[PDB]
Amino acid sequence: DSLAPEDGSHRPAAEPTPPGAQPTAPGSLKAPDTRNEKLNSLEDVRKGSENYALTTNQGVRIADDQNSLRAGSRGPTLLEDFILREKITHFDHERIPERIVHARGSAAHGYFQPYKSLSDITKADFLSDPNKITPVFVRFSTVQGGAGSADTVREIRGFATKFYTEEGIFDLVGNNTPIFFIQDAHKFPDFVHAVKPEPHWAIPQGQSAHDTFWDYVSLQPETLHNVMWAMSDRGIPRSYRTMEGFGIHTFRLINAEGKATFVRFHWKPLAGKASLVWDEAQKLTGRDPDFHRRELWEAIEAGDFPEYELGFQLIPEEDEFKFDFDLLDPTKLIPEELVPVQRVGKMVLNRNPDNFFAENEQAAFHPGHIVPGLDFTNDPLLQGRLFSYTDTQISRLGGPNFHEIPINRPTCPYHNFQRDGMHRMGIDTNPANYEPNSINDNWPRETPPGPKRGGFESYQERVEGNKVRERSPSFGEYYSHPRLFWLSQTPFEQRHIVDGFSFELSKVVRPYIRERVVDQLAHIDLTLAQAVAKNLGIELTDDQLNITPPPDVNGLKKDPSLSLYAIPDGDVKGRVVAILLNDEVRSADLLAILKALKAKGVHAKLLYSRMGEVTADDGTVLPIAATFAGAPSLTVDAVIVPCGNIADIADNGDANYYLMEAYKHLKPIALAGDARKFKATIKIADQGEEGIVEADSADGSFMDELLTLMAAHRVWSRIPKIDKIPA
Amino acid sequence: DSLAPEDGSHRPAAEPTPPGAQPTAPGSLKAPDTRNEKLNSLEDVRKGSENYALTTNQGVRIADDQNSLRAGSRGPTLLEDFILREKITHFDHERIPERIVHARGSAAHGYFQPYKSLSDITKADFLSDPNKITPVFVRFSTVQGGAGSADTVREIRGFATKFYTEEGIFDLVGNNTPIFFIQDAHKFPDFVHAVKPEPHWAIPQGQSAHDTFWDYVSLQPETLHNVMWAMSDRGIPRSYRTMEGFGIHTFRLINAEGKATFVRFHWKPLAGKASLVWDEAQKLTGRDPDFHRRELWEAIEAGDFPEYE
Amino acid sequence: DSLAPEDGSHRPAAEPTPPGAQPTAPGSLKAPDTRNEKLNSLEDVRKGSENYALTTNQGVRIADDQNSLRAGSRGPTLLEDFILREKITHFDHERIPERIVHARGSAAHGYFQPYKSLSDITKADFLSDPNKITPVFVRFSTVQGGAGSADTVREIRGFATKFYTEEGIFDLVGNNTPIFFIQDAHKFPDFVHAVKPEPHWAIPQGQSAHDTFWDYVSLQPETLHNVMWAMSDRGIPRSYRTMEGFGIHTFRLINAEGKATFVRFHWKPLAGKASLVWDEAQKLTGRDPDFHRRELWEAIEAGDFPEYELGFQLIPEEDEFKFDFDLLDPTKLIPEELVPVQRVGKMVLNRNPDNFFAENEQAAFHPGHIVPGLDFTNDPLLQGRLFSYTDTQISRLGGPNFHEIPINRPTCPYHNFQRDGMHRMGIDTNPANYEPNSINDNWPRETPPGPKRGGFESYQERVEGNKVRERSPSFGEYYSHPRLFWLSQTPFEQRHIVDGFSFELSKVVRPYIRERVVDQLAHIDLTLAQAVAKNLGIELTDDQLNITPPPDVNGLKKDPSLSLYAIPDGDVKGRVVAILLNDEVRSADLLAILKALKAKGVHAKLLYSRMGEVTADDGTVLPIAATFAGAPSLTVDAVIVPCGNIADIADNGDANYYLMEAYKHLKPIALAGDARKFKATIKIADQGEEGIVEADSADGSFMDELLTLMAAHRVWSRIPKIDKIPA
Amino acid sequence: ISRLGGPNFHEIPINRPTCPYHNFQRDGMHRMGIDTNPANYEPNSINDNWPRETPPGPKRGGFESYQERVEGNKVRERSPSFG
Amino acid sequence: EYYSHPRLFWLSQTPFEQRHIVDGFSFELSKVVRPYIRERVVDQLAHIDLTLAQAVAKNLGIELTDDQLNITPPPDVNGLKKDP
Ligand code: HDD
Ligand code: HDD
């Protein structure tokens, strides 16, 4: 019609902008100059809109898209209205089956590059030269919940990376913890059914806090290691940018000489490790169920590209049996104190998709998609995964041509004798559709294995044994890994683990299941078992009190790489601060605050009791981003209150509760000038307390002290003080 | 191995119990004596479990459901393991496309009966006799969110009833407000796309609080009436038991003489009308996203059967 | 490798060659410089093969495409063999549901061009200028059989044309007869189920000759007009190039002033009308079930492009009720004597597809696909069709994005707010997916109807009446059109119709059905009724002999344009002759023979009792195309036997049968020199017979005679004589 | 999965076993059977682990594969004995 | 006609239900990033009821224009000023 506003404010600038500054938009319109080989190859299917006539799918221009064709303007709709029927038919069949697991996920485009050639240990082309750039598409996810469930639940997270290499797609399909819950893929449907919503009523969504999960866990002790990780703060990451990624399974690297090296894949977050606290995560599932999806997308639009370092744990073939645990058991981690992670390369996620459905929802990742230079192992969970991810896309993506959906297509050549199938896009001109043929001189042809550009050949591992449905005896140990994890955590991390188990078991209706899990915990660590038992009103028996603790893992009594926080790895860039405004802010405080945050890449959101604008003491007009209730403290990392007319918000329930909530959740709070009158809201001593920044003005060291607190993420020393507090 | 506790406390007593007194269970096990013609007719496909062997779908008993078939106990999985492949194949194809709209919903079985014969205004068989009962199956829902989204969002709610009558199925597919947002069905995809999560990033879930919805409303003043109802406390009902239901459209009733009467359908909640307050409703989407689903299920297990006039 | 023969004889020349001179090939390899806008736009999805490596669909090169991965070379296949699983998975899902009706069909690409601008009667862009070339894709088909059924069955044929216009796809979905069997689309499932294989045992394939079909016809007299056409030789076309096409329904042309003109669409074969005879057609279903598909493909490879003239019957809106039939009744034809066909343009089919499945099997045509300048009418059969052809593709082609399958894509712009759906190819960048919107300034936008490039607006026909499920009383006449058709046929065409009814009804097991059908024939024409009755051993009653014949159609007692052969229109270019060789052929006969055929564009196939070659009297080495049994007379239009050593084949039973079969099927036979010894096997008098060319040698007079016979297609005067030929 | 529309093709009448079939598989397109088991996983205590595994035996026993000896490298190779 | 039914609904609500309607609109429009959309919706509320339009505008920091303050309320629905 010409409905947009004449000032052109309906459209976001095509330049990096902080979260909340402009309306978000499709990647290619937001960052048109951000390109890569894969992004460029999708140009054949990108569709624009501006200046085009509205049509049917058959290209017929529509004159009136506001009405159905009827006999009389109040008459019946006619069957001949093909414009209406096409438009409703397409709407009526928009949905496709969601992923069986990991249905909730958020994705982005980026690129990877190795630091140096790894040709001595692998012939994989994407790892052969530091100047070879490989486009990637990454999808992060939860596990149990549907595609419409919430982001900040307590659960493992998926981390899947599609590498578009010159010798084929390589999908590295991992999670955010270094082990899985079960050992053999045959039990995957039992474990998943137990964690998913129960079958009679389909409750609960996005939560393992229910009877069937804890029933299965209590009967299958192999699950305890990953359950410990889920009950820790690892289960509630602050962002997909601040969590680790792992392939879990031991795979193989194969070099040109045919030597095999065992390898476990790692991703290290260059923004550091950081998690929420349970009350915050749970409440944030209501206040903003799309918090992680939102934070990922906004980070990329702001230029805070998610960056990860790919690393390898490498173990020589001859050391297969040198550890206390089996290398092929996916419920066991390889302690970094035993086998260090070797830095391999960096991945940078720097562009959002254009259309979520087309690129995110239809993407298909599968761990069987490997390339020459990589190979599998006999890990029994990985072995069964190889069957499932090709199988499942026959219903999810409608057929066997899912590699032809734009986001999934290889950027390297693909040619073979496969034909037809639903939705076939490629029109083959080969005279032959079989080999061997003479009618096309046998093309396309097989290629012998070789150092570069050769055909895939499996490593000739020796296989010896009878055909058995049997778990290796070497996998029958379930408590030392859980115990190593427990002992590696800080005291506040241990408390959060105890609280996670306590909260989840309190939602288990059948008391005997609680009792049975507590008995399993007594096989891991007595302190942990006693603390959870106490919270459940359960007393350990004398037998439980004397269960001997599992042995150390290869002599280790702890490994600090297992803790999120034991070793500081703080990074403030991309964090966000709530600034609580008043109707006459001291502009000098705000100038100091905003400029210090901007110099460190820390975002801010100006909050007030209404929307619109407020005018500072010097006449500066301040645009309000959101109200106190509209953008709760759950969404920020720290809270700053500048001086001015504090009487304006001193008695505002929301403004006070904002600080109580952030204080409860261990976030740094800074109060300037008269804003120190809020100290009584959070009961802060006159002398002050570690974790609260306070001064006569926001000058001098006020912002540096606040930023130091943000670098340590949360104020763990405040835990004992929050215990009480009615918030 | 892994067996029921000695005391029998793993299984819910089959009698009406208050919320939280017993673990919830499938209806036919919770209330085996509760019947109606539709519930009885579903007996051909109900499948039990106690005392039966674990099998493949082809009926072959399974000896070891804990392991894949491999060459050696630390060896590769064999392709001949058909037990594993059937089991994982069925898991791999569990999901079906969710509803385009109203994908999140909660349902129950029940029955309907007219107060008196309505034969003077309609020849419909299910409304012809006060002592002639008609089985029903009712689904309550939200509109925008996926099947895994939260219950206590701010939104219109669906209220659909399937009447299994002697002369055919009658579905009364209504909502909890007496009007809809738009006038012509040709605009349905435009309105639904405007309220659904935005196409670039698929945010936000279960919320009309976002630019495209208010853009559409601002350009299409026909939407204001139902938007008023959604912004009121009608948009955040306390329970599915405590909201009204309406067919919205004028339909016709046709009697045996051929006379047509225009009719609009209503459901009155005999538990009364009651809604949450916003702060409560929004926080409850995070503390218990399945609150309405749970509340309906438990009211029926407790004997507080949802009743509507 | 190198399996191709060193001489390069595995690959067909990329130049026009006669049927059987080279192996057939994908269209783009056979005729790479035959281009059109649609063919060029498919280049993005065409995939080659030569010189490429064999890969998985994920782009991974394969080393050994001959073996599965196993533990030991006689061991069990491993689940980790992803190369095997991908290849078998694709194979396992190659098939898609066939079309409900018209599953058997053969297709080609071409182009259309108008003879003059039709802007005075229609604003349809493709008809606006003689220099506007519109790419087309045409699929010809039978109706009842599966996709694997035979071509030369007795049945109506489908003739579907997809026009890729600059203002949208226009599909003209018609048949080879001018009416349909039923009046309202609500009965289509009943008619179709009655003609299809019966439900208990799924017999018979590709045949109406069974009880349920004749049961339905006997109880629904509206079907009799199309049944008459099916029982005539119209039901057994010689080739898709030699049949007419009709849209059947009255549609509307709309001009720039908004005036509506009723129109019926026609396709006139520029190669002339020609049909087989029943025994030849039925036997040809067994000797070559692919005969019509082959004939179409090979005509195009030879440069005998199928050409049709588009024709319109135009009736002013004010003449709606001036006929004695209803213009909206699809069981009624508009006699060309009353309303002439205006010649409007030409369509030429000049290129075969590259991949049958991708382009033919997946093509989707629908009569509802119209463009501005065209509109529907209330014909109750066309009205219901409008719902079906969009609905059926949701299962057949897997979803609502079937317009994105390459062959179905418009070549003109298409932009709208529809999104998602299974296998979504297009990646939309529009910030908005709804209208009205302000965030993209309401694009893509609606367009007002107009003279050119305007949006679609339906013609504002007045609708008055009650909502009823009622047949118009004006459609209640069922015998006058059938009679008009009958009286328009030649005496031998009449005899063939009698023979068609008689043969089909003999296969009806319930005698009462045969009698009820004969009763219907008595309401059409007594002579027809009596002759069919006599072949069934049925006696017309007193009452049936006195049924008054239906009235003439608007004064007509016949219309020669309804006959296949009444008005000469034959064309020999593209026809084929079988030449029966001996071991010492009179080379002078062959030269005269082949020089004369080549001047008329008539092909030849050289046959012998074995493959390889024979050597003529002068030493010319003649290559053999097929044996006498290998390429039966059914597959050729005429038979020529040159002199030489007749003794060699004079006692060859296959050689004698070849002539007896061709004789019986009314084909021209030419005998030179001692080839005249074969007159005894087909019992031809010493003085000769019209239809048999004989002479001392094969000079130019002999060939002109033979080519004259071939232009008249068949020797109809020989019918009375074939009775006594045991063949 | 494509020919018969999904993983519940054993529920199409002609394919149905005449002997008992019980397991923990659920859902899928056109699911006919309505499972009443409180549990859809094993091991479970909430339904006392039913339906239960059965050891192999002379009659009515669970399926156990014959324990054939496997020995060799992981190869894509045709046995020479087949040539 | 788009405003009389909205108005009938508004006037039939109790004072605390009216406040909750105001709060619902205020909360939802505060999450609309583009300010002109908020303004356009406030303009539509001014065609329904000025008390409602002003209470929402106040929470959005918007000031109604003089023209908006003079929009005539829609007619009653068949004489009804409210329906409990
Ligand atoms: C045998 C079945 C099986 C097993 C044992 C696993 N999963 Fe899996 N997973 C699948 C069956 C599967 C799946 C049904 O095939 C899925 C869902 C839909 C899809 O495309 O893949 C899937 C999705 C899937 C995703 C989502 C990819 C995306 O974003 O689309 C990730 C991140 C994981 N899984 C990761 C893992 C890890 C790290 C595993 C253990 C080490 C694990 N899975 C075990
Ligand atoms: C109400 C349904 C109905 C009606 C009354 C008819 N058809 Fe039809 N026909 C269809 C329902 C259909 C179909 C179910 O929708 C099909 C099969 C699959 C599809 O794509 O289209 C089809 C295909 C189809 C084809 C094959 C298109 C191709 O090559 O793919 C042609 C030539 C015809 N039809 C022509 C006719 C004619 C000239 C009709 C009467 C005048 C007739 N149809 C009436």
Residues near A387 by Cβ (< 8 Å), separated by ≥ 6? A185, B84, B85, B88, C79, C85
Of the candidates C410, C475, C460, C447, the one whose C-alpha atom is nearest the C-alpha of residue C187 is C475
Return d(Cα D15, Cα D25) in angstroms, integer.
17
H or E element in which residue B73 lies? none
Q: What is the 3-state secondary structure (H, E, C) of C132-165?
A: CCEEEEEEEECCCCCCCCCCCCCCCCEEEEEEEE
Among A573, A598, A620, give the residue marking a domain's end: A573
Which residue(s) pair with A654 in the sheet? none
Question: What's the CA-to-centroid distance between C101 and ligand 2, angstroms?
Answer: 7
Determine the 3-state secondary structure of B282 from DSSP: helix
Torsion C705-C708-C709-C710 (CA) sign? positive
Q: Name the pairing type of β-strands A626-627 and A603-608.
A: parallel
Q: Resolution, rounded to a tenth of an Å?
A: 1.8
Return d(Cα B4, Cα B12) in angstroms, integer.
12
Return d(Cα C76, Cα C74) in angstroms, integer.
7
Q: Please tell me whether residues A568 and A588 are part of one structural domain.
A: no
- Tokens, residue C51: 């010189």
Contact (CB, 8 A) for A384 and C21: no
Residues near A251 by Cβ (< 8 Å), separated by ≥ 6? A262, A263, A264, A265, A370, A374, A375, A376, A377, A382
Of the candidates A474, A486, A487, the one whose C-alpha atom is nearest the C-alpha of residue A322 is A474
- Tokens, residue A550: 């599992």
Active site residues of A: 102, 175
For chain D, list the contacting chains (3+ Cβ pairs, <8 Å).
A, B, C
Phi-psi group of C219: left, alpha or beta (phi > 0 → left; psi -120 to 50 → alpha; rest → beta):
alpha
Q: Whose CA is nearest to atom 12 of ligand 2?
A: C385
Q: What is the 3-state secondary structure (H, E, C) of A553-592?
A: ECCECCCHHHCCCCCCCCCCCCCEEEEECCCCCCHHHHHH
Cis omega (within 30 of 0) for bond into B199 = no
Return d(Cα E20, Cα C407) in angstroms, integer.
56
Q: Name the pairing type of β-strands A692-695 and D34-35.
A: unpaired
Return d(Cα B157, Cα B139) in angstroms, integer.
10
Does residue C325 form part of some domain? Answer: yes
Q: Please tell me whether residues A372 and A498 are part of one structural domain.
A: no
Identify the burial level of C1 via C-beta atoms within 10 angstroms of its C-beta, where 0-12 means exposed, 13-18 middle and 19 or more buried.
Answer: exposed
Q: Do A394 and D2 touch (CB under 8 A)?
A: yes
Taking the Cβ of residue A19 and every Cβ of chain B, the question of whether any pair is shorter than 8 Å is answered with no
Which residue(s) pair with C95 in the sheet? none
Q: Please tell me whether residues C344 and C364 are part of one structural domain.
A: yes
Question: What's the CA-to-centroid distance between A63 and ligand 1, angstroms?
Answer: 47
Residue type, C28: S
- Full DSSP string of B197-239: PPTTT---TT---SHHHHHHHHH-GGGHHHHHHHHSGGGSBS-
**Residue C614's Cα: distance from chain center in Å?**
37
Taking the Cβ of residue B185 and every Cβ of chain D, the question of whether any pair is shorter than 8 Å is answered with no
User: What are the backbone angles phi and psi of residue C207, rounded to the nearest 5°?
Assistant: -135, 140
Determine the 3-state secondary structure of A245 from DSSP: strand
Nearest CA in chain A to B30: A200
User: What are the backbone angles phi and psi of residue C269, rounded to the nearest 5°?
Assistant: -75, 120
Does residue C364 form part of some domain? Answer: yes
Among C526, C545, C573, give the residue marking a domain's end: C573
Return d(Cα C362, Cα A422) in angstroms, integer.
9
Q: Please tell me whether residues A539 and A578 are part of one structural domain.
A: no
Torsion A266-A271-A277-A280 (CA) sign? negative
Determine the 3-state secondary structure of B151 from DSSP: coil
Taking the Cβ of residue B29 and every Cβ of chain D, the question of whether any pair is shorter than 8 Å is answered with yes
- Tokens, residue C41: 């736009």
Cis omega (within 30 of 0) for bond into C5 = no
For residue C395, the ligand closest to its alpha carbon is: 2
Among A362, A384, A410, give the residue marking a domain's end: A410
Q: What is the 3-state secondary structure (H, E, C) of C327-358?
A: CCCCCCCCCCCCCCEEEEEEEEEEECCCCHHH
Does residue A142 form part of some domain? Answer: yes
Q: Please tell me whether residues A251 and A216 are part of one structural domain.
A: yes
Q: Please tell me whether residues C545 and C671 are part of one structural domain.
A: no
Does residue A458 form part of some domain? Answer: no
Determine the 3-state secondary structure of A195 from DSSP: helix
Contact (CB, 8 A) for B257 and B271: no
C-beta of A388 in contact with ligand 1 (< 6 A): yes
Residue range(s) defining the domain that contains residue E16: 1-84
Query: Which of B69, B80, B84, B190 to mutate to probe the C interface, most C CBs <10 Å?
Result: B190
Contact (CB, 8 A) for C229 and C197: no
Return d(Cα A383, Cα B70) in angstroms, integer.
10
C-beta of A123 in contact with ligand 1 (< 6 A): no
**Residue B166's Cα: distance from chain center in Å?**
24
DSSP state, residue C407: G
Nearest CA in chain B to C435: B190
Does residue A435 form part of some domain? Answer: no
Which residue(s) pair with C628 in the sheet? none
Return d(Cα C172, Cα D1) in angstroms, integer.
35
Q: Please tell me whether residues C522 and C609 are part of one structural domain.
A: no
Q: What is the 3-state secondary structure (H, E, C) of C177-209?
A: CCCCCCCCHHHHHHHHHHHCCCCCCCCCCCCCC
Q: How far is CA B258 from CA B118, B261, B264, B265, C385, in A?
A: 14, 10, 19, 20, 32
Taking the Cβ of residue B277 and every Cβ of chain E, the question of whether any pair is shorter than 8 Å is answered with yes
Return d(Cα B302, Cα A705) in angstroms, integer.
57
Of the candidates C190, C189, C217, the one whose C-alpha atom is nearest the C-alpha of residue C501 is C217
Number of alpha carbons in the 13 Å side-chain half-sphere of residue A642: 27
Other CB atoms within a 10 A radius of the CB of residue A438 amount to 13
Determine the 3-state secondary structure of C543 from DSSP: helix
- Full DSSP string of B100-141: SS--SEEEEEEEE--SS--TTT---GGGS-TT--EEEEEEEE
Contact (CB, 8 A) for A349 and A276: no
> For the domain that residue A612 is a member of, what is the CATH number?
3.40.50.880
How large is the C-alpha radius of gyration of chain D?
19
Identify the burial level of A580 via C-beta atoms within 10 angstroms of its C-beta, where 0-12 means exposed, 13-18 middle and 19 or more buried.
Answer: buried
Method of structure determination: X-ray
Does residue B221 form part of some domain? Answer: yes
Does residue B216 form part of some domain? Answer: yes
Which residue in this structure is represented by tokens 């019966």?
C198
Please identify which of the residues B36, B40, B90, B175 carries the catalytic annotation.
B175
Contact (CB, 8 A) for B201 and B242: no
Nearest CA in chain A to C437: A3
Number of folded domains that form chain B: 1
Query: Which of E13, E19, E31, E62 to mutate to probe the B interface, most B CBs <10 Å?
Result: E31
Q: How far is CA A354 from CA A307, C438, C489, in A?
A: 21, 19, 64
Return d(Cα A358, Cα A407) in angstroms, integer.
8
- Tokens, residue C158: 């489908």
Nearest CA in chain E to B177: E9
Q: Whose CA is nearest to atom 5 of ligand 2?
A: C185
Return d(Cα C586, Cα C593) in angstroms, integer.
11
> Which residues of A does the annotation place in the binding site?
389
Q: Please tell me whether residues C614 and C489 are part of one structural domain.
A: no
Return d(Cα C631, Cα C613) in angstroms, integer.
16
Whether B102 is catalytic is yes
Return d(Cα C491, Cα E51) in angstroms, integer.
91
> For the domain that residue E72 is a member of, what is the CATH number?
1.20.1370.20
Of the candidates B212, B234, B210, the one whose C-alpha atom is nearest the C-alpha of residue B157 is B234
- Tokens, residue A266: 């790692």
Return d(Cα C381, Cα C330) in angstroms, integer.
7
Q: Whose CA is nearest to atom 6 of ligand 1?
A: A385
User: What are the backbone angles phi and psi of residue B305, rounded to the nearest 5°?
Assistant: -60, 130
Q: How far is CA A511 from CA A224, A501, B7, B9, in A?
A: 19, 14, 12, 9
Residues near C303 by Cβ (< 8 Å), separated by ≥ 6? C16
Contact (CB, 8 A) for A525 and A545: no
Q: How far away is chain A from the Cα of C398, in angstroms, using its nearest Cα?
A: 7
Residue from the list B71, B77, B220 with its beta carbon closest to the beta carbon of C436: B220
Cis omega (within 30 of 0) for bond into A26 = no
Q: Please tell me whether residues C74 and C150 are part of one structural domain.
A: yes
How large is the C-alpha radius of gyration of chain E?
13
Residues near B94 by Cβ (< 8 Å), separated by ≥ 6? A100, D7, D26, D27, D28
Residues near A443 by Cβ (< 8 Å), separated by ≥ 6? A430, A432, C49, C50, C51, C52
Torsion C444-C449-C450-C455 (CA) sign? positive
Q: Please tell me whether residues A140 and A188 are part of one structural domain.
A: yes
> For the domain that residue B103 is a member of, what is the CATH number?
2.40.180.10
Residues near A528 by Cβ (< 8 Å), separated by ≥ 6? A486, A494, A497, A498, A501, A521
DSSP state, residue A76: P
Which residue(s) pair with A554 in the sheet? none
Return d(Cα A240, Cα C302) in angstroms, integer.
63
Contact (CB, 8 A) for A384 and A184: yes
Cα distance from N-terminal residue to C-terminal residue, chain B: 51
C-beta of A104 in contact with ligand 1 (< 6 A): no
Whether C355 is catalytic is no
Other CB atoms within a 10 A radius of the CB of residue A445 amount to 21
Q: How far is CA C521 from CA A308, C278, C515, in A?
A: 84, 21, 10
Query: Which of A467, A470, A517 to mutate to probe the D interface, most D CBs <10 Å?
Result: A467
Question: What's the CA-to-centroid distance between C184 and ligand 2, angstroms?
Answer: 14
Q: What residues are in contact with ligand 2 under a 6 Å CB criterion?
A: C 99-102, 105, 139, 141, 158, 160, 173-175, 180, 185, 188, 248, 330, 364-365, 381, 384-385, 388-389, 392
**Index of the ligand 2 atom closest to the CA of residue C99:** 18
* Buried-exposed string B198-229: b where 16+ CB fall within 10 A, e elsewhere: bbbbbbbbbbbbbbbbbbbbbbbbbbbbbbbb
Contact (CB, 8 A) for C585 and C622: yes
User: Which residues precede gaps in chain E, with C-N > 2.5 A?
Assistant: none
Return d(Cα A580, Cα C292) in angstroms, integer.
81
- Full DSSP string of C271-327: T---B--HHHHHHHHHH-TTHHHHHHHHHHHHT---EEEEEEEEEEGGGTT-SSS-T
Please identify which of the residues C36, C102, C109, C266 carries the catalytic annotation.
C102
Q: Please tell me whether residues A164 and A86 are part of one structural domain.
A: yes
Does residue C541 form part of some domain? Answer: yes
Q: How far is CA E12 from CA A483, E42, E51, in A?
A: 64, 21, 14
